[PDB]
């Protein structure tokens, strides 16, 4: 009846790769930090694509300026845990100059305490989400990684265990037809035109969906991701133009503050067609507001909504409402969470392959031993390693802009 | 890097009872109301039955003690066991040994959430969403957390992401708040003795009773009323307003648990700043969503009644999403290892098992060996620093095994 | 002007047949306590069918563990009444160890008093429905049976008389086409696939409906029973996929706690198509909540919602709203009620025949002289016997696990 | 087993009146307001007409006594009769003898609900849902229950499922509550004498009048105000708040019965814990649904006005479903045999037919032979233990038969 003995945390450190102060196209934790000729930068509709200079490329307006934050927590026994997110150099500042004070000297089991202190202390400048929240998440995930690594358990077991033997995935990218051949259950395509394109824009994105429906058959799901680029009327028209092809859902039509627009969009959705959002929302209380709009599925990003600790709360909010939660695809950081969620029957795999024809690891190259779906699935046994089961690729050129103590 | 801890499968589940109608009455243990003569807990307490002359003086008389204590023990293949107790007794053993065993045996000790979902899904046709069948499910869920914490060598509070406070502070429930202040509790909750059929006299008596404790206890020590489902909206509103001058902090469970619409109206009519609370008899996370939506200030599930620790953690996230507190019905260690991790449970309940509320008789006395009690109305996290829920089963109690399999 | 003299109740006794502690497939009061090769166990969608081990058979997850409760009340003149429900051995415990105290020594006319005492006294563990409520119902029905048997009147006459000369039935089972040939007005089929089956599942259950529509013509009703197995989005899609075949209603799509989901499902239903539920709800106050969701028809089970005394209140709640009530089919216990309800224009007959080709009595074999519809109807004259007009088949092997006094 | 009681058919229905504009004024009986000179019931009572100088002092002056008493008697083929009385007189006999007879004659004595539905369906084009035609229907429905109880040899209260209390306690309605306390009543309800046209003086007078009775009656004896449809929301709110300091329990019928929206607002503006009640002039169960939905605390149908005992039992279930009380307008035995069976009617009304409220003159004096009166503000169930509604018709009264058929 002798309790396992636990170390205190000795050090936290932060590095970054890519972003505006290192090397363009570093990939890793910042999905959009890619090179030339990538589907993910191919005329994707956004709040800026209405501007001729920023229509063809999201990189051009700066989708890639942040790069990847890496947070590593070191216990007094020299065991480490870490995690990666989008924030880069500014995230380093926050961790090294502010948050380190709540982290260092706590018990490795003090995760929810540190998470609470981190939210309480940054509330005056975090704005609910975005950069600061991504940084908090990255710290939360490192803490879980360390705690599992010290205990010798996968995070999914610390959470109360898998509720299914494998995760099934849909794939996000320009090639649902190729994804069907790889064994995925569905494909989510980006929209390429926006409100300023009017009926032509609706015609083109609907024709894209109609084409893939013909290529993929009736049972493979199709979805559109709209990345905050629309307004209520354009989204309504687009959803109705795609209804004949059984589009499963239409995602992130509006900027995240537009809760009232989401409520109106869901009311106007075609019967049976779901409306989703959440990947840019942050904090449990924001997801309360989002859920009450009546959207079918919230899609938090673990690396952005506040971390694993927040994600688990969001899952319970959804469950309380008899609804699914389907987190954005965040490799192992989402895998260990969703395989324990009875109300996450499937998950997302984002194509980082430039032409969506191969299975590049999602956070390539920053994670060593990073799993990829095989036949559209990741077996729970693949996740049976301590923490989130990966190691940091120290061959990437990690920059340390700040230090402390 | 490291290979995981190897975890055993679950080999056996077994169920026993003590007390209740088919054994020795007054056993105590998991059923708080399985007590002897002259207990404050049976002293003319207002109930849905107290309108009847024959059932007015005693709750025991209408049968509040018929069920007794259910004990569930789960045994891993490596011979380690975990256990828990709740109110369900003999019928509880039937549900465990003849139904739920099929979902428990042969699973991993980490498959807690999986088993939980299977128990809810398989009993949905007979569970009524709360009460006896839910108590049984809850008791199994707690046994599983116990066993898992014991196999791992960690207190459940650490597997949940750790304490967010170094100790738990307690208010005390029973007839002597004046005395509880002397034992160091932060407040005291009294039962009501009169009901709607007692009219204005009932209100005057119970309010007088509170006026007296404010006087004896000073202005800062909390006073509350527990109404055990015994009122209607009008009577409850009259009471709350009659008690407002004494700064009564909350008024608890005025209505039967189905009366959601009535709680909404009661909350709307409550004196400014006085809380209306409920939840001890609710079960299932979805019932708690409907509860939370009535606008009541505090939900109060019993961990061993609401569905288990797995459900309690969900109810906590639901309340936290709404910016509200969650304050479980005092369930000894089963609550302690939870509430110590909840940012939104700033205090907890100790329910007086002492006949005259003068002593710190343990919450689940005599069934739990080494059961912590509030030391100066506080319980420090070090006390909780033992594997699982940190207690042992008292096998000197006369455990009966009505069923096997 | 000399009033009929009435006996007091002398004894109540409880037996069970079937369930986990007697013989598999006992049938009788537990509809699902059947053998192998039965339509009613044929890949029926449920909250558990998402689990590969519990997909093909409801028996496999334990739909049949309870078996049949029999409650017999004996008056001091030695006249008996009785009734049957689903609860078995645990129901015996409740009746023999708890409820007997409110029952024994009352007047045979004291039905609503005993019913109130039974609800008031079990409120702390009944959870609103399910097992405990089924047991209360069984006692309520026995009391009505005895009272009518003593007076020498059918229950339907004690209630204020028939409002129609016969009851017309739809049939529930896998063969609406066979039911049409037997003279029923409609057939309600179970769904076989659930949310985890996606578009394929919708395609298959809709094709089942389309096939029967072709076989049965336009005026014979078709309905689907979904037995708590869906979520809002899947139910919406299924209802719209069946609208072209004029599906009359879609029943029990959601678990009974999901009132808010019912409200959203009814809003999204195809024009003219009804959404129904209620067979797993218990207590008058639960049916208030259910009615206010806007569902078209509540479908209480007399043996489960609290008894005849509660059923009659539910009928009035429906009537107050200008709506029908259509109780689940519970043989004579529903017949004597619904033939007096102006707002129950038709009733349900459940096929206990394994292949739905013959008219086995619904509670076969526990009831002697149990009527069956002839040409889809039961003439009121068939019900013109005292109480509920049947006798207990004492040749079944009734077990008495408990006794008292 | 047993052959049923053989029941006769209904052979004749016959209708008589006394009192009212076409006979001897001041007859009393079923019409409570058919009284002589100097009655408290006609003493400057506030009404919708009292704003007019000519109709201010007397209700008799505007014609509250024009209708008189309707008597319906139903005769079975075995020569047994049952009867009831209500307010409708001569026009009432026209409706019975020239319309409703066709639904009554030739039915079974048990066909109560059937006849009831037929009477509502057939008069829907001229009934206005309350008032005169509803009174007539109600009187027939009561005659049928009477006749049935008499043929069977049971009090109606036993056919309804029996008493849920051994006696009925009563508050008294009239000008001398101080005196009613002395007769043992649990409270007293006073009429208002002034109306909106009297402004602040009106309020001061009626409030003063209540301040005086609190003083004379002590704090525990209930005080209430009846406003007989005579106010508007603003005047009613001013009154309630002027009476709050005297713990006035409820304020009754402030508004004409159509003003549902106004009752909703009045209830919203009422002092905390003070009830707002209504319903005496409502008719049809659907009107009561709309009433209940305004949020008023207590609905108060008159049994002989609201549609009959059949409707009253429905209104009771509606209130009970909402967790609320139902307290009929005192209708002597017609209410007593109902309310004694309603869990949600914990007290009843005795309306003073005594000119100066000093004596226990019977409610329907002189038309009912052996009419019970509260013995010490209570009426025991043994008093009710006679067949049907337990009274006889006073044929010494000068019964007129305006119509036959
Ligand atoms: Na997205
Ligand atoms: Na409580
Ligand atoms: Na059903
Ligand atoms: Na009145």
What letter would DSSP give residue A96?
I
Q: Give the number of other Cβ atoms within 10 Å of residue A395's Cβ.
A: 9
Closest by Cα among D117, A345, B122 to C161: D117
Q: Which of C354, C327, C321 is nearest to C341 (CA)?
A: C327
- Say yes or no: A50 contacts chain C, CB-CB below 8 A: no
Per-residue buried b or exposed e for D296-333, using 16+ beta carbons within 10 Å of the residue's own CB: bbbbbbbbbbbbbbbbbbbbbbbbbbbbbbbbbbbbbb
User: In whole angstroms, what is the distance from residue D108 CA to residue D148 CA?
Assistant: 9
Considering only the beta carbons, identify the residue of B90, B125, B258 that sits closest to C283: B258
The strand ranges marked E within C272-372 are 274-277, 297-298, 347-350, 367-368
Closest CA to C340 of C304, C377, C383: C383
- Residue B356: count of CB within 10 angstroms of its CB: 14
User: Three-state SS for B275?
Assistant: strand
Contact A160 B3 (CB under 8 A): no
Contact D28, D211 (CB under 8 A): no
Residue in C376, C362, C375, C374 with CA at minimum distance from that of residue C332: C362
**What's the rounded Cα separation, in Å, for the pair C63 and C110?**
34
CB within 8 Å of C383: residues ≥ 6 apart = C154, C156, C332, C335, C336, C339, C371, C389
> What's the A219 CA to ligand 1 centre distance in angstroms?
22
Q: Is the dihedral of CA C254, C257, C259, C261 positive or negative?
A: negative
Within 10 A of D400 (CB to CB), how many other CB atoms are there?
A: 18
CA distance A155 to A337: 8
Strands A166-172 and A347-350: parallel
Of A110, A317, A342, the CB nearest to B321: A317
- Which burial class, exposed, middle or buried, applies to B374 when counting CB atoms under 10 A from its CB (0-12, 13-18, 19+)? buried
Q: How far apart are CA B132 and CA B94, in angstroms?
A: 12
Task: Confirm if B102 and B61 have CB atoms less than 8 A apart.
Answer: no
Q: How much distance in Å is there from the Cα of C327 to the middle of ligand 3? A: 10
d(CA D236, CA D252): 10
Backbone angles phi, psi at D246, to 5 degrees: -100, 15
DSSP state letter for A101 = H
Task: Return the H-helix or E-strand segment holding C135.
Answer: helix C131-151
C396: nearest Cα among C369, C361, C368, C371: C368
Whether the CB of D6 is below 8 Å from some CB of chain C: the reply is no
Three-point CA angle C238, C241, C246, nearest 5°: 105
What contacts C274, CB < 8 A, 6 or more positions away? C248, C249, C250, C295, C296, C297
Q: How far apart are CA C138 and CA C91, in angstroms?
A: 9
In angstroms, the CA A177 to CA A236 distance is: 26
Residue A195 DSSP code: G
Residues making up the annotated binding site of B for Mg(2+) are: 226, 252, 280
Q: How far apart, in whole angstroms, are the C-alpha atoms of residue D73 and residue D91?
A: 16
Which uninterrupted H or E stretch holds C92? helix C88-94
Q: Which residue of C has its CA nearest to D4?
A: C152
Chains C and D: 3 or more CB pairs within 8 Å of each other: yes
Q: DSSP states of C236-301 as a string?
A: HHHHHHHGGGT--EEE--S-TT-HHHHHHHHHHSPTT-EEEE-TT--SHHHHHHHHHTT-SEE---
Contact between residue D108 and residue D78 where contact means Cβ atoms under 8 Å apart: no
Q: How far is CA A314 from CA A259, B290, B339, C185, in A?
A: 17, 17, 19, 47
Active site residues of B: 329
The three-point CA angle D205-D208-D213 to 5° equals 130
Answer yes or no: are the C-beta atoms of A269 and C232 closer than 8 Å.
no
Tell me the longest C-alpha to C-alpha distance in chain A.
70
Strands of D55-205, DSSP E: 69-76, 81-87, 167-173, 187-191
Q: Do C231 and A294 touch (CB under 8 A)?
A: no
D257, D278 contact by CB (below 8 A)? yes
Q: DSSP string covering A36-54, please?
A: SS-GGGSS---TTTTSGGG
Question: Quick count: other Cβ atoms within 10 Å of Cβ C52?
Answer: 8
Q: How deeply is A206 buried, as exposed, middle or buried, from its count of CB atoms within 10 A (0-12, 13-18, 19+)?
A: buried
Nearest residue to C332 via CA among C302, C359, C296: C302
Distance CA A192, CA D353 (A): 84
- Cα separation, B56 vs B344, in Å, equals 37
Of A209, A305, A207, the residue nearest A248 (C-alpha): A209
φ/ψ of residue C370, rounded to 5: -75, 120
Cα three-residue angle D343-D363-D64, rounded to 5 degrees? 110
Chain C contact for B67, CB < 8 A?
Answer: yes
| Closest partner CB to D346 (pick from B197, B262, B269) | B197
Distance, in Å, from the CA atom of C20 to the CA atom of C374, rounded to the nearest integer, reads 34
- Would strands D81-87 and D69-76 be described as parallel, antiparallel, or unpaired? antiparallel
Separation in Å, CA of A256 to nearest CA in chain C: 23
Q: In angstroms, how far apart are the furthest CA atoms of chain D?
A: 73
Beta-carbon contacts of B152 under 8 Å, excluding residues fewer than 6 positions away, are: A4, A151, A153, B5, B159, B387
Angle at D143 between CA D139 and CA D148, to 5 degrees: 150
User: Which H helix or E strand runs over C74?
Assistant: strand C68-75
Which domains does chain C possess?
1-152+394-405 (3.30.390.10), 153-393 (3.20.20.120)
Report chain D's C-alpha Rg in angstroms: 20
Scanning B244-324, the segments in alpha helix (DSSP H) are: 260-269, 285-292, 309-321
Helix (H) or strand (E) holding A338: helix A331-338
Helix (H) or strand (E) run with residue A91 in it: helix A88-94
Resolution of the experimental model in angstroms, please?
1.8
Asked if residue C113 lies in contact with residue D163, where contact means CB atoms within 8 angstroms, the answer is yes
Dist. CA B226 → ligand 4 center (Å): 36
H or E stretch covering B348: strand B348-351
Alpha-carbon distance of D143 to C335, in angstroms, equals 27
Cα–Cα distance, A210 to A113 (Å, whole number): 50
Angle at CA of residue C44, ends C40 and C50, nearest 5°: 150
Nearest to A103 by CA among A46, A131, A65, A141: A141
Question: What chain B residue is nearest to D247 in terms of C-alpha separation?
Answer: B200
H-state helical runs in A95-229: 100-103, 111-122, 131-151, 155-158, 176-182, 198-216
CA of A255 to the centre of ligand 2 (A): 44
**Under 8 Å between Cβ of C106 and C36:** no
Gap between the Cα atoms of C88 and B15, Å rounded: 19
**Pseudo-torsion of CA B100, B106, B112, B117, nearest 10°?**
-50
| Contact criterion met (CB below 8 Å) for B47 and B229 | yes
Taking a C-beta distance cutoff of 8 angstroms, is the pair A161, B9 a contact?
Answer: no
- Provide Rg for chain A, Cα atoms: 20
Strands (E), D89-228: 167-173, 187-191, 222-226
CA–CA min distance D34, chain C (Å): 30
Q: How far is CA D345 from CA D327, D336, D341, in A?
A: 6, 10, 8
> What 3-state class would DSSP assign to D220?
coil
Residue whose C-alpha is closest to residue B161's, from A381, A84, A83, A106: A106
CB B64 within 8 A of CB B45: no
Q: Is A33 within 8 Å of A27 (Cβ atoms)? A: yes
Beta-strand relationship, C221-225 and C186-190: parallel
Determine if residue B287 is left, alpha or beta; phi over 0 gives left, psi from -120 to 50 gives alpha, anything else beta. Answer: alpha
- Listed residue (C95, C139, C150) closest to C405, CA to CA: C95
Which one of the listed residues A115, A280, A328, A336 is annotated catalytic?
A: A328
DSSP one-letter string for B189-253: EEEP---GGGHHHHHHHHHHHHHHHHHHH-TTSEEEEE-TT---HHHHHHHHHHHGGGT--EEE-
Q: d(Cα C326, Cα C345) in Å, to the nearest integer?
A: 8
Strand-pairing partners, residue C276, are C251, C297
How are beta strands D348-351 and D167-173 bridged, if at all? parallel
Alpha helix stretches (DSSP H) within B41-88: 59-62
Label residues B76-113 b or e (16+ Cβ within 10 Å = b).
Answer: beeebbbbbbbbbbbbbbbbbbbbbbbbbbebbbbbbb
CA–CA dist D218, D204 (Å, integer): 21
Query: By three-state DSSP, how is residue A324 classified?
Result: coil
CA distance C49 to C47: 6
DSSP C229-250: ---HHHHHHHHHHHGGGT--EE
- Chain centre distance of CA B54: 28
Backbone angles phi, psi at C131, to 5 degrees: -40, -55
| Chain C CB within 8 Å of residue D162 CB | yes
Element (H, E) at B325: strand B325-326
Buried b (16+ CB within 10 A) or exposed e, B172-208: bbbbbbbbbbebebbbbbbbbbbbbbbbeebbbebbe
Contact C265, C116 (CB under 8 A): no
Q: In this complex, is the C-beta atom of C385 within 8 Å of any C-beta atom belonging to chain D?
A: yes
Q: Of C312, C165, C155, C163, nearest to D120 (Cα)?
A: C163
Q: Residue B352: name the closest of B169, B180, B168 by CA.
A: B180
**Residues ≥6 apart with Cβ < 8 Å to B310:** A160, B112, B113, B116, B141, B145
| CA Rg value for chain B | 20
Query: What is the full DSSP assignment across B81-122?
Result: EEEEEEE-HHHHHHHIIIIIHHHHTTSBTT-HHHHHHHHHHH
Q: Tell me which chain C residue has its CA closest to the CA of residue B253.
A: C124
E strand or H helix at D319: helix D309-321
Q: CB-based burial of residue D380 (10 Å sphere; 0-12 exposed, 13-18 middle, 19+ buried)?
A: middle
Asked if residue A376 has a cis previous peptide bond (ω within 30° of 0), the answer is: no
């Amino acid at each position: 009846e002798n309790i396992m003995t636990l170390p205190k945390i000795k050090h936290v450190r932060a590095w970054f790769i890519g972003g505006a102060t290192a090397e363009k196209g570093a990939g890793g934790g910042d999905y959009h930090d890619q090179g030339g000729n990538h589907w993910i930068d191919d005329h994707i509709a956004t709040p800026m694509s209405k501007y001729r200079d920023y229509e063809q490329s999201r990189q051009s307006f700066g989708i890639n300026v942040l790069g990847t934050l890496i947070v590593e927590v070191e216990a007094e026994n020299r065991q480490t845990g870490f995690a990666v997110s989008t924030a880069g150099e500014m995230g380093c500042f926050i961790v090294e100059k502010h948050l380190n004070r709540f982290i260092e000297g706590k018990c490795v089991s003090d995760i929810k305490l540190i998470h609470d202190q981190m939210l309480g202390a940054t509330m005056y400048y975090s704005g609910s989400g975005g950069l600061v929240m991504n940084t908090i998440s990255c710290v939360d995930l490192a803490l879980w990684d360390l705690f599992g690594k010290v205990v010798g358990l996968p995070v999914y077991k610390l959470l109360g265990g898998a509720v299914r033997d494998e995760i099934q995935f849909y794939a996000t990218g320009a090639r649902p037809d190729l994804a069907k051949e790889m064994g995925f259950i569905g494909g989510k395509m980006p929209t390429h035109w926006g409100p300023h394109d009017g009926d032509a824009g609706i015609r083109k994105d609907a024709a894209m969906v109609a084409d893939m429906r013909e290529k993929c058959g009736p049972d493979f799901w199709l979805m559109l991701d709209c990345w905050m680029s629309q307004d209520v009327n354009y989204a309504t028209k687009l959803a109705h133009a795609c209804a004949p092809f059984n589009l499963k859902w239409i995602e992130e039509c509006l900027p995240p503050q537009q809760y009232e627009g989401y409520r109106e969009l869901k009311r106007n959705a075609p019967a049976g067609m779901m409306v989703t959002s959440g990947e840019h929302h942050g904090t449990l209380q924001s997801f309360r507001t989002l859920a009450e709009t009546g959207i079918d599925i919230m899609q938090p990003d673990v690396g952005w909504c506040g971390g694993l600790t927040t994600l688990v709360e969001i899952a319970a909010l959804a469950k309380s409402r008899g609804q699914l939660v389907v987190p954005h695809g965040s490799s192992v950081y989402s895998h260990h969470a969703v395989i324990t969620f009875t109300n996450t029957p499937f998950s997302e795999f984002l194509m980082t392959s430039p032409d969506c024809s191969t299975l590049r690891p999602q956070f390539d190259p920053i994670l060593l031993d990073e799993p990829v779906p095989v036949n559209g699935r990741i077996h729970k046994s693949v996740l049976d390693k301590p923490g989130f089961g990966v190691e940091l690729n120290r061959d990437c050129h990690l920059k340390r802009p700040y230090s402390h103590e």
